[PDB]
Symmetry: C3
C-alpha cells in the first residue's frame, strides 16, 4: 500500500528525567523520541517534512529504511520550508530515522531521532509477539549548544526514550512508567541505538534474549543470546520470554551507561494491562 | 541432574599483577575470577550464597544462565546472611556470572565475577575439543573505592583472569603461566567480558578462530573469524587450531587494551602437559 | 598457486589531509595504507619484508590471513635486515595486515597497515561484484612520537585510507577523490578497521548493506543490515547496490568519528568511469 507520513521539525522544551528537568530539544513533532512510523515491507512511503516557522535551524530527514540520494532527498530545509520525498520500504525489520542536518552529532543529541518499523510482508516470518515495545538509546548532553563536549563524548547520561531511568521505578522512585507482560508471552523489543557516539551491550537482567534479529531481518536470526551489541546508528529486534512472574531489567551492560540512566524494568505479572505493549502503546511516553 | 552450588562472598586482598601488587578485592570464594561453575543444559542448579560475617558490604549473585526474578532472586544480602535460589540451565553455552549489588560497576570492578559453562545436552553439537581454557576480561581500577574513576572509564589496566599480563611470559619476565596445546588440537576458549565498561575485540595473533559461538550456543556458529567483538557483560566460545609448533597471542586488539595487560600466550608444543586445559586446570590460576 | 609478495618498511613523510599536511609515517612501500595484497584461497604466499637501511626503527609483518608462529615468523627486523616466511591462505575473505613491532599501537598509528584479500576458491560463493573498493579505517594522532596520547586514545581524526575526508567532496571542497558506480551495480566494499584503538559502526547514508560477510567469509553472510560493527583489528566485506542515480555516504556512524574525517562518498551515475573500482584502482590513492 501507499502511506502518507508527515512530520514537523519542532524546537521546544522537553523533560529528560523523572524530576521534571527540561532542556531545549530539537524534535520531530515536539516529542523525544519522534513518533513511531510503522509500514509493511514493500509499502510506498510518501514522506513530508515541515520545518516549523519558529525553528532557528535548518532540519532534514534520514530514514535508514530508505534507499535514496543523500544529496537531494536528505537535504536540509530552512525554518518555514516543506520537503517531500517518496521511498519504498524494500527490507523488513527495524530502522533508525533521524535528522541529517549540520552537524548531525548535535541534531541527534538534541532529540531528532525515532524508529521506523517495517513489518515483514510474510506475516509468518517472525514468531508471533504478544507484546511489542520500542526502546531507543541515546546520550544526553548537559548543554545542547556545546558541540565540543559532544565531539569529546562528554555525555551526562545514557538514556532510553529520552529519559534518565524513565522505566526504572526500582532505581528511581519518581519513575512512573515500565514495561509489562505476562509469564510465557513473547515480548518483542524494537531497539535502536541513536548514539550519537556510544555503543550498547544490551542484556535482560534475570533473562536471556530468546532470539535476536540484526536490523530486524528474519534471515539474520540468532538464538539464546545473553547480550547483543548495537553500535551507534544501528537497530535490532530482540525477543524476551519470562517463565516466571517478577521482573527483568533491560540494561546497557557497559555499566557506566547503565548507572547513568540506561535501565528499563519489565514486570511480568498474570494481571498485566491488556493495552500495554499493544496498539499505540508500544513506545511508552 | 540436580547440582548444588554454594559460593561465599569474601572481601580479601588479592594480587593483580606478576610482581605481587595487591588490592582489596570483593570476591566469590576468596579468588578472582570466582570458581568455574559447570553444568549440563537442562540441569537444576540449587544455588546458595553466603555473605561472610566479616564482609563490610551487602552482596548478591546474578547468573546469566538463569531465568528468574531480578527483584527477589538477585537481591542483595547483608554480611552474615545466606540466600538460596534454584534455576534450570535452559540454554547451552557460556555465561557471565557476577554480583548484582549497588553499585554493580564497583562490585564487578572489585572482582565479583566468573563464568558458568552449560554443556550442550547433545554432546555432539559442538566439535570435540582437545583443550579448554577460560579467559575472563575485566578492567582494573587503581583505587577500588574511587567510583568516579569507574564512571569516567579511567582504568589502569585491562586484564585476563584478574592479572596484568597473567599469561604473557613474552612481555612480562615475571609471568609464570600460559596456555598449552599440541599442533592440530582443537583448543576451545570460553571467553567472558566482565567489563564493567569496556568492549573486547578478541584476536589470536598468528592464528584465526576456527569457529565462534555467540553465548556459546551451537546454533549461532560463525566460521574462520580473524576477530570477534564481545561487549561488556557478554560471552562467547572461540575455537583455535594451530597447524604448527610455536605460539599464538590471544589479544584484545584495541591496542591500548592489549598494551595495558590484555595478552595471553598459547604455546603449541608436541610435548604439551597432558593435564593442561583439562579437568579443573581450565581456569589457570 | 605460489605467489611472491615483497614489501619494504619505509619511514617517510606522507600527506594525511586534502590541504597537504604531512607527518613522519612508518609504512609498507612508502604509502599509507600499504599495497593491496590479493591471492586466492589455498594459495602459497612466499613473503619477504625488507627493512630499509635508512629506517630508524625495527619492523615486522603480521598477516591476519596467516596461521604461523608469532615468535619466529612475526619477529622484528632491524634497519638493513630482511625477513622471509611462507604461509598458505587457508580461509577466504578479507584480512588486516600490519607491523607487529614494539609498540604495535604506534606502528599501526603511524601507517603500517594494509589489507590482504583472499578470493574464494569457489568463484560462485560470492555474488559477482561490478565494483570493488578498499576502505581502511584508522585513527590519526597529532604527534606520531607521543605514545601516551595513543595509550589515552586521544586521537585528532578518524580516517579512511590515511586521509581526513579523503573521499568527501561534500564536506571538504579540497577533496578530489570519491567512489563511483552505476545504479543497479553490486559494489563490494573490503573494509578493514586498523585502529589501533577505535570501533567502527559502518553505515551507507541513504542506502543499506545488501549483504555483509564477517571476515569476508561466504559462510557468515548477513542480509540487509543498516549498519555493521567492525572492531579494532577486524575486517568485513559489505555489498551496496543503489537503485537510483545520486550519492550515498559510507560513514562510521559513531558521529564524533564521522565528523572527524570518517566519511566516504560514493557517486552513482550512468556514466561512471569504467576503470573505477576495477583492476588496481580498488584502493583509490
Ligand atoms: Cl576455578
Ligand atoms: Cl560446578
Ligand atoms: Cu535537525
Ligand atoms: Cu543514520
Ligand atoms: Cu558484591
Ligand atoms: Cu550481567
Ligand atoms: Cu613497524
Ligand atoms: Cu592484528
Amino acid at each position: 500500500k501507499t502511506v502518507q507520513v508527515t512530520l514537523h521539525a519542532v524546537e521546544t522544551d522537553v523533560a529528560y528525567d523523572n524530576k521534571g528537568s527540561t532542556y531545549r530539544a530539537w524534535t520531530f513533532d515536539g516529542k523525544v523520541p519522534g513518533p513511531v512510523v510503522r509500514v509493511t515491507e514493500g509499502d510506498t512511503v510518501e514522506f513530508t517534512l515541515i520545518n516549523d516557522k519558529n525553528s532557528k535551524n535548518s532540519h532534514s530527514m534520514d530514514f535508514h529504511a530508505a534507499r535514496l540520494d543523500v544529496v537531494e532527498d536528505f537535504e536540509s530545509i530552512k525554518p518555514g520550508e516543506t520537503k517531500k520525498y517518496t521511498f519504498t520500504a524494500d527490507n523488513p525489520g527495524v530502522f533508525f530515522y533521524h535528522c541529517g542536518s549540520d552537524p548531525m552529532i548535535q541534531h541527534i543529541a538534541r532529540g531528532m531521532y525515532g524508529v521506523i518499523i517495517v513489518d515483514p510482508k510474510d506475516a509468518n516470518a517472525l514468531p508471533k509477539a504478544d507484546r511489542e515495545y520500542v526502546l531507543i538509546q541515546a546520550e544526553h548532553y548537559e548543554n545542547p549548544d556545546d558541540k565540543t563536549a559532544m565531539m569529546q563524548n562528554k555525555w551526562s547520561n545514557v538514556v532510553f526514550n529520552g529519559g534518565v531511568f524513565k522505566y526504572d521505578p526500582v532505581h528511581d522512585s519518581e519513575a512512573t512508567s515500565w514495561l509489562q507482560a505476562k509469564p510465557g508471552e513473547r515480548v518483542r523489543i524494537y531497539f535502536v541505538n541513536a548514539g550519537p557516539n556510544e555503543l550498547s551491550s544490551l542484556h535482560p537482567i534475570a533473562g536471556i534474549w530468546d532470539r535476536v534479529y540484526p536490523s530486524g531481518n528474519p534471515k539474520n536470526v540468532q538464538y539464546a543470546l545473553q547480550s547483543y551489541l548495537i553500535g551507534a546508528g544501528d537497530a535490532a529486534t530482540l525477543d524476551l520470554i519470562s517463565p516466571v512472574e517478577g521482573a527483568n531489567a533491560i540494561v546497557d551492560h557497559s555499566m557506566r551507561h547503565a548507572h547513568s540512566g540506561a535501565i528499563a524494568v519489565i514486570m511480568f505479572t498474570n494481571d498485566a494491562d491488556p493495552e500495554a505493549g499493544r496498539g499505540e502503546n508500544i513506545l511508552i511516553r
